[PDB]
Amino acid sequence: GPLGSEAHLYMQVQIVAEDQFCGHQGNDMYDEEKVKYTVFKVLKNSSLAEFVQSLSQTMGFPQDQIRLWPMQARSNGTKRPAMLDNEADGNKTMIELSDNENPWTIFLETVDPELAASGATLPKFDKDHDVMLFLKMYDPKTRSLNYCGHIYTPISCKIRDLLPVMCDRAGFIQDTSLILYEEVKPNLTERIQDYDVSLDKALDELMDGDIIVFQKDDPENDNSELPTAKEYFRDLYHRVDVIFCDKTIPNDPGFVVTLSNRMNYFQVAKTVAQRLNTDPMLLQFFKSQGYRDGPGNPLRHNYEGTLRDLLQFFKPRQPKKLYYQQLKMKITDFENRRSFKCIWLNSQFREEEITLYPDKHGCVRDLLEECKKAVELGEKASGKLRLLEIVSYKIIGVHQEDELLECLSPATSRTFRIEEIPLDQVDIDKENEMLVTVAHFHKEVFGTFGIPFLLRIHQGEHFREVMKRIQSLLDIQEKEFEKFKFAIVMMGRHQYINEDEYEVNLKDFEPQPGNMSHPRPWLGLDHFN
């Protein structure tokens, strides 16, 4: 709103008291958004000595019984209390001491009120030989930080001489072995390896407002998921909330899961599966799309990246969200299944469309048995299935059960038909019988149509026996059947068979001896549809 005429002469001073440090679970002393201050509107050019006296009066302590430690930013990104020399700077202005920072935050150290009632006085601080250190206790069992206050200590004090104070402030029995760290910055908790050296040597760049975090040295620490403070702070640094949604449930708001940015695929899958009460291998996940919300490409189960890689495209505004779905087979089998579309020719000689799901590494036999488990075979029939390949309404191949599915043509030209073998064809007499392919056409043999079939024929047979086999299979009226002409077709050359002279010689339907590749002769039926 309207700034007053002199507003440019005033700055905000935020005073934080030590009770604001208690309960903080993060790095540094407090969370900048949860911290409660005492706020002062102070002239920029008023003196530090003025402020110290006025504040002592306001907060209710004798001026000797308090000390100011400005909260100061460090190059590594942390914010820590720093020493302020009141006697030597008492005449400097507030804005020059604040380094033009506005608002300016200051930690106000006071004596404990009740303990001060005992006549206790704020000890004196030798700026040249003393350091103010802050203490935190890490409890692995509850996985929590417990604020343990601060201490004045000579730079020359040995780390080992500080262990009694840590034990006493944490409530540990004296001579409890301890592990000690410096909390340098988020994701850097450096263990202190030698307690028999001075603070100056144990800590690199020893300053006021440094932080030692300690914990019991206890076998039971290993029972916790975060046994050390180092791991606690690493986990804290890498924590991230992610919303998971089932992509097969429309407008699903999903549920939140707390994860770590450095989990691999398996850890993420483990966590989400435990909270869905399903097997981890029964889930499929999806990368993000980036710009537009909604699931993206499926995530291969052997993904080698981290959760951070999967989330890297969410801007600070967008809610982190991933998409999954639940499966009925293990993810490795789901990724490996091939959708094989084929025709099932039923016992009534009618086509049905069926999609089977064999493993992409399977053979023809796996496909045939997948289909057999799905259909209703003939009344009293062979109970054996065969797989044909049809192109332009002609049977061009019969595939043996050992061929790999990868060998079959994926071209959409090919129609693959599964059919029950008729009983006269399960085991033909190989010296006088033969299976020939039959296909319908009209005029030139180029124009094929209809349902082709395999037909058993016998040497020496009369051709009207062949026509009656054909007629019984085909199943139409005699008026249509009589019109049918018949031919033997080979390599674009066809000659017509005399229906009433009956010559059936296997040699006329055989390829050149030794040749199994050449498209074999076949029996062409001549009519119209």
Side-chain angles (χ1 to χ4, degrees):
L3 299 179
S5 153
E6 301 191 321
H8 67 282
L9 295 175
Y10 289 84
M11 65 190 291
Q12 300 306 92
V13 173
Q14 294 164 343
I15 291 278
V16 54
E18 195 160 16
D19 63 302
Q20 295 300 294
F21 300 174
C22 304
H24 177 56
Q25 296 306 297
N27 283 282
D28 285 353
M29 325 308 166
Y30 54 83
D31 190 327
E32 182 63 49
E33 278 132 32
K34 315 222 211 169
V35 64
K36 295 323 161 215
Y37 294 123
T38 306
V39 185
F40 290 77
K41 206 169 217 70
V42 189
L43 290 164
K44 287 181 184 175
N45 45 320
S46 52
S47 79
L48 170 64
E50 287 187 274
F51 185 76
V52 170
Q53 183 222 293
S54 180
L55 168 88
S56 42
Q57 200 287 321
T58 297
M59 310 285 287
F61 307 97
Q63 180 163 339
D64 73 70
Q65 236 185 26
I66 66 167
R67 189 170 172 112
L68 266 48
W69 306 80
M71 298 302 296
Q72 185 184 265
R74 299 176 168 187
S75 42
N76 55 22
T78 57
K79 201 174 180 185
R80 307 295 191 84
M83 194 229 62
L84 189 49
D85 193 356
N86 189 19
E87 64 257 52
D89 297 11
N91 298 288
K92 297 194 180 59
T93 63
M94 293 294 282
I95 190 79
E96 81 170 295
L97 277 170
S98 78
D99 203 49
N100 291 268
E101 187 186 353
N102 180 16
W104 189 32
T105 310
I106 300 172
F107 165 50
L108 172 63
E109 170 184 19
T110 74
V111 183
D112 189 336
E114 58 88 347
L115 188 81
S118 180
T121 181
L122 196 76
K124 65 211 282 141
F125 188 86
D126 189 335
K127 65 190 260 302
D128 302 308
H129 300 89
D130 279 355
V131 63
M132 191 199 210
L133 288 182
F134 291 84
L135 300 180
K136 300 179 191 183
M137 186 263 282
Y138 174 62
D139 177 20
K141 179 150 106 143
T142 56
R143 286 134 301 143
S144 67
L145 291 182
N146 305 94
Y147 184 65
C148 278
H150 66 266
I151 47 172
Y152 288 180
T153 171
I155 308 292
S156 60
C157 187
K158 308 259 164 61
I159 290 284
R160 185 168 307 286
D161 294 335
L162 300 191
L163 307 176
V165 186
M166 299 168 174
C167 281
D168 168 76
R169 270 152 196 253
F172 300 160
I173 301 290
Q174 276 311 328
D175 295 287
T176 288
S177 181
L178 301 174
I179 309 180
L180 269 61
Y181 308 80
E182 175 179 10
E183 175 199 329
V184 184
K185 70 192 182 71
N187 207 36
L188 187 49
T189 315
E190 209 85 78
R191 188 177 152 265
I192 310 173
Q193 301 181 49
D194 197 330
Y195 304 166
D196 293 307
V197 303
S198 78
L199 271 171
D200 216 339
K201 294 206 135 161
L203 270 50
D204 64 325
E205 262 297 308
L206 173 70
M207 293 165 55
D208 300 304
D210 282 355
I211 295 176
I212 301 183
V213 55
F214 60 96
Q215 58 181 92
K216 277 182 179 180
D217 183 40
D218 190 312
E220 309 189 32
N221 292 348
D222 286 321
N223 294 342
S224 156
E225 281 290 319
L226 297 165
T228 70
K230 191 178 190 69
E231 266 296 315
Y232 172 84
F233 279 120
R234 278 174 179 185
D235 182 288
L236 175 72
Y237 180 78
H238 290 301
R239 224 162 280 180
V240 62
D241 277 7
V242 183
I243 305 162
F244 286 75
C245 298
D246 196 319
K247 77 168 272 177
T248 70
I249 298 180
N251 298 137
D252 183 14
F255 56 99
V256 181
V257 176
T258 51
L259 302 158
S260 162
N261 271 125
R262 52 191 201 104
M263 278 167 161
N264 55 31
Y265 175 92
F266 178 73
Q267 282 151 26
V268 175
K270 193 193 182 14
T271 310
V272 185
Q274 180 273 349
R275 189 158 121 79
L276 289 161
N277 220 346
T278 78
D279 192 303
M281 292 165 120
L282 280 160
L283 291 169
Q284 191 184 43
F285 289 91
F286 297 87
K287 295 190 172 177
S288 158
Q289 304 201 347
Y291 307 90
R292 295 201 266 90
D293 179 18
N297 292 325
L299 189 54
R300 57 182 330 117
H301 81 286
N302 71 309
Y303 182 61
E304 293 169 339
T306 64
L307 178 63
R308 184 187 310 105
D309 299 321
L310 299 176
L311 304 173
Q312 68 190 276
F313 304 107
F314 288 92
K315 292 143 172 184
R317 181 178 300 271
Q318 296 162 264
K320 310 214 184 261
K321 175 158 61 183
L322 291 179
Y323 284 91
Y324 71 104
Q325 72 169 337
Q326 320 224 22
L327 313 170
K328 292 118 199 197
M329 60 203 303
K330 272 115 213 153
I331 171 68
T332 316
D333 289 318
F334 182 82
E335 293 176 342
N336 273 322
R337 74 169 196 181
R338 172 176 181 188
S339 290
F340 208 102
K341 307 180 128 201
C342 34
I343 297 303
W344 158 242
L345 185 68
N346 58 34
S347 71
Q348 290 86 349
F349 206 65
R350 282 191 289 256
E351 293 186 290
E352 306 177 28
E353 309 270 352
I354 190 169
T355 299
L356 304 161
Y357 302 91
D359 201 288
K360 60 189 286 188
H361 310 295
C363 64
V364 155
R365 176 182 310 109
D366 317 318
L367 182 63
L368 292 175
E369 195 70 51
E370 269 285 320
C371 182
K372 184 180 178 175
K373 299 178 299 180
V375 303
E376 170 186 299
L377 302 98
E379 192 33 71
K380 287 136 112 196
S382 67
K384 294 193 151 204
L385 314 186
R386 61 187 177 203
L387 170 75
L388 313 188
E389 186 180 330
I390 294 165
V391 171
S392 307
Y393 307 94
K394 292 189 305 177
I395 294 164
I396 61 108
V398 187
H399 290 259
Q400 196 39 234
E401 312 199 355
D402 319 75
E403 307 185 26
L404 298 68
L405 302 178
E406 183 196 350
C407 323
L408 302 174
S409 168
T412 70
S413 61
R414 318 272 183 266
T415 313
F416 286 102
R417 197 169 86 200
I418 294 177
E419 69 189 25
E420 183 170 39
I421 302 173
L423 284 140
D424 59 322
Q425 305 183 354
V426 53
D427 194 67
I428 65 174
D429 280 319
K430 253 151 184 225
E431 282 164 351
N432 40 359
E433 286 183 322
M434 178 177 43
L435 297 188
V436 302
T437 62
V438 194
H440 314 263
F441 80 106
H442 180 90
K443 202 60 180 179
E444 295 299 2
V445 289
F446 172 91
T448 52
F449 66 87
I451 307 177
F453 53 94
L454 279 162
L455 168 69
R456 175 191 61 86
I457 56 167
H458 195 287
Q459 170 103 7
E461 209 175 16
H462 288 256
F463 196 45
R464 64 206 190 283
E465 312 304 300
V466 168
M467 286 140 92
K468 196 58 172 233
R469 210 162 292 113
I470 292 179
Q471 181 179 182
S472 162
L473 182 273
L474 271 204
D475 185 268
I476 75 195
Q477 313 194 52
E478 300 60 6
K479 315 174 157 190
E480 205 176 12
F481 182 88
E482 164 71 350
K483 304 146 73 180
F484 279 57
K485 302 198 71 175
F486 309 86
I488 313 171
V489 195
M490 178 63 293
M491 187 61 179
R493 281 67 181 271
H494 57 282
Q495 67 181 118
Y496 277 77
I497 169 57
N498 208 333
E499 281 149 62
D500 63 284
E501 225 183 358
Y502 309 138
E503 58 278 68
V504 173
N505 184 8
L506 297 201
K507 254 194 140 142
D508 323 318
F509 298 94
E510 297 152 22
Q512 179 156 81
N515 196 359
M516 299 283 297
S517 322
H518 219 121
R520 297 115 198 292
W522 48 282
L523 180 50
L525 315 174
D526 214 336
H527 69 115
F528 60 93
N529 55 328

PDB file of all heavy atoms in Angstrom, residues 24 142 171 268 302 305 323 382 423 463 487:
ATOM      1  N   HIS A  24      13.311 -29.052  14.930  1.00  0.00           N
ATOM      2  CA  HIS A  24      13.656 -28.984  13.515  1.00  0.00           C
ATOM      3  C   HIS A  24      14.325 -30.290  13.067  1.00  0.00           C
ATOM      4  O   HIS A  24      15.246 -30.792  13.715  1.00  0.00           O
ATOM      5  CB  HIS A  24      14.564 -27.784  13.276  1.00  0.00           C
ATOM      6  CG  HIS A  24      15.049 -27.647  11.867  1.00  0.00           C
ATOM      7  ND1 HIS A  24      14.193 -27.567  10.787  1.00  0.00           N
ATOM      8  CD2 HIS A  24      16.303 -27.538  11.365  1.00  0.00           C
ATOM      9  CE1 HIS A  24      14.902 -27.432   9.678  1.00  0.00           C
ATOM     10  NE2 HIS A  24      16.185 -27.415  10.001  1.00  0.00           N
ATOM     11  N   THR A 142      13.943 -43.898  16.124  1.00  0.00           N
ATOM     12  CA  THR A 142      12.878 -43.039  15.623  1.00  0.00           C
ATOM     13  C   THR A 142      13.259 -42.309  14.342  1.00  0.00           C
ATOM     14  O   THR A 142      12.429 -41.579  13.807  1.00  0.00           O
ATOM     15  CB  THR A 142      12.472 -41.981  16.681  1.00  0.00           C
ATOM     16  OG1 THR A 142      13.628 -41.219  17.091  1.00  0.00           O
ATOM     17  CG2 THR A 142      11.823 -42.622  17.919  1.00  0.00           C
ATOM     18  N   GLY A 171      20.716 -37.020  27.326  1.00  0.00           N
ATOM     19  CA  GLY A 171      20.194 -37.982  28.272  1.00  0.00           C
ATOM     20  C   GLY A 171      20.869 -39.338  28.252  1.00  0.00           C
ATOM     21  O   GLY A 171      20.367 -40.270  28.889  1.00  0.00           O
ATOM     22  N   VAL A 268      11.686 -48.483  -6.686  1.00  0.00           N
ATOM     23  CA  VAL A 268      10.397 -47.835  -6.945  1.00  0.00           C
ATOM     24  C   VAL A 268       9.284 -48.874  -7.067  1.00  0.00           C
ATOM     25  O   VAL A 268       8.213 -48.742  -6.455  1.00  0.00           O
ATOM     26  CB  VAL A 268      10.482 -46.963  -8.211  1.00  0.00           C
ATOM     27  CG1 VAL A 268       9.117 -46.387  -8.560  1.00  0.00           C
ATOM     28  CG2 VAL A 268      11.526 -45.854  -8.038  1.00  0.00           C
ATOM     29  N   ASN A 302      14.108 -53.648 -17.099  1.00  0.00           N
ATOM     30  CA  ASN A 302      15.541 -53.556 -16.847  1.00  0.00           C
ATOM     31  C   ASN A 302      16.072 -52.133 -17.042  1.00  0.00           C
ATOM     32  O   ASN A 302      17.238 -51.950 -17.428  1.00  0.00           O
ATOM     33  CB  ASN A 302      16.292 -54.553 -17.731  1.00  0.00           C
ATOM     34  CG  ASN A 302      16.280 -54.159 -19.189  1.00  0.00           C
ATOM     35  OD1 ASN A 302      15.228 -53.887 -19.754  1.00  0.00           O
ATOM     36  ND2 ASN A 302      17.452 -54.139 -19.811  1.00  0.00           N
ATOM     37  N   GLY A 305      18.357 -46.369 -15.207  1.00  0.00           N
ATOM     38  CA  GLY A 305      18.431 -45.045 -14.632  1.00  0.00           C
ATOM     39  C   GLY A 305      17.825 -44.996 -13.243  1.00  0.00           C
ATOM     40  O   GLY A 305      17.495 -46.014 -12.631  1.00  0.00           O
ATOM     41  N   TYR A 323       2.770 -42.868 -14.061  1.00  0.00           N
ATOM     42  CA  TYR A 323       1.650 -43.714 -14.435  1.00  0.00           C
ATOM     43  C   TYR A 323       2.066 -45.175 -14.447  1.00  0.00           C
ATOM     44  O   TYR A 323       3.143 -45.525 -14.939  1.00  0.00           O
ATOM     45  CB  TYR A 323       1.098 -43.324 -15.808  1.00  0.00           C
ATOM     46  CG  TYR A 323       0.265 -42.064 -15.801  1.00  0.00           C
ATOM     47  CD1 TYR A 323       0.853 -40.830 -16.017  1.00  0.00           C
ATOM     48  CD2 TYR A 323      -1.117 -42.111 -15.584  1.00  0.00           C
ATOM     49  CE1 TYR A 323       0.107 -39.672 -16.018  1.00  0.00           C
ATOM     50  CE2 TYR A 323      -1.883 -40.942 -15.582  1.00  0.00           C
ATOM     51  CZ  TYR A 323      -1.257 -39.729 -15.801  1.00  0.00           C
ATOM     52  OH  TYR A 323      -1.969 -38.555 -15.801  1.00  0.00           O
ATOM     53  N   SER A 382      -9.653 -85.727 -35.273  1.00  0.00           N
ATOM     54  CA  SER A 382      -8.288 -86.124 -34.945  1.00  0.00           C
ATOM     55  C   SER A 382      -7.797 -85.523 -33.633  1.00  0.00           C
ATOM     56  O   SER A 382      -6.962 -86.127 -32.951  1.00  0.00           O
ATOM     57  CB  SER A 382      -7.361 -85.727 -36.089  1.00  0.00           C
ATOM     58  OG  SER A 382      -7.274 -84.312 -36.188  1.00  0.00           O
ATOM     59  N   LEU A 423      -9.539 -86.603 -40.360  1.00  0.00           N
ATOM     60  CA  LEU A 423      -9.005 -87.898 -39.936  1.00  0.00           C
ATOM     61  C   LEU A 423      -8.449 -88.701 -41.102  1.00  0.00           C
ATOM     62  O   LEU A 423      -7.518 -89.489 -40.918  1.00  0.00           O
ATOM     63  CB  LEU A 423     -10.051 -88.713 -39.192  1.00  0.00           C
ATOM     64  CG  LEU A 423     -10.248 -88.183 -37.776  1.00  0.00           C
ATOM     65  CD1 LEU A 423     -11.716 -88.235 -37.473  1.00  0.00           C
ATOM     66  CD2 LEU A 423      -9.410 -88.952 -36.742  1.00  0.00           C
ATOM     67  N   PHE A 463     -11.905 -89.901 -60.774  1.00  0.00           N
ATOM     68  CA  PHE A 463     -11.969 -88.476 -60.467  1.00  0.00           C
ATOM     69  C   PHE A 463     -13.298 -88.054 -59.855  1.00  0.00           C
ATOM     70  O   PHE A 463     -13.347 -87.017 -59.180  1.00  0.00           O
ATOM     71  CB  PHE A 463     -11.696 -87.635 -61.716  1.00  0.00           C
ATOM     72  CG  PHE A 463     -11.360 -86.201 -61.411  1.00  0.00           C
ATOM     73  CD1 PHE A 463     -10.463 -85.886 -60.402  1.00  0.00           C
ATOM     74  CD2 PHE A 463     -11.959 -85.167 -62.113  1.00  0.00           C
ATOM     75  CE1 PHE A 463     -10.157 -84.570 -60.110  1.00  0.00           C
ATOM     76  CE2 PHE A 463     -11.660 -83.843 -61.822  1.00  0.00           C
ATOM     77  CZ  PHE A 463     -10.754 -83.546 -60.822  1.00  0.00           C
ATOM     78  N   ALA A 487      -9.154 -77.986 -62.837  1.00  0.00           N
ATOM     79  CA  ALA A 487      -7.895 -77.903 -63.562  1.00  0.00           C
ATOM     80  C   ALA A 487      -6.746 -78.254 -62.634  1.00  0.00           C
ATOM     81  O   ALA A 487      -6.850 -78.133 -61.412  1.00  0.00           O
ATOM     82  CB  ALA A 487      -7.679 -76.508 -64.158  1.00  0.00           C
TER      83      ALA A 487
END
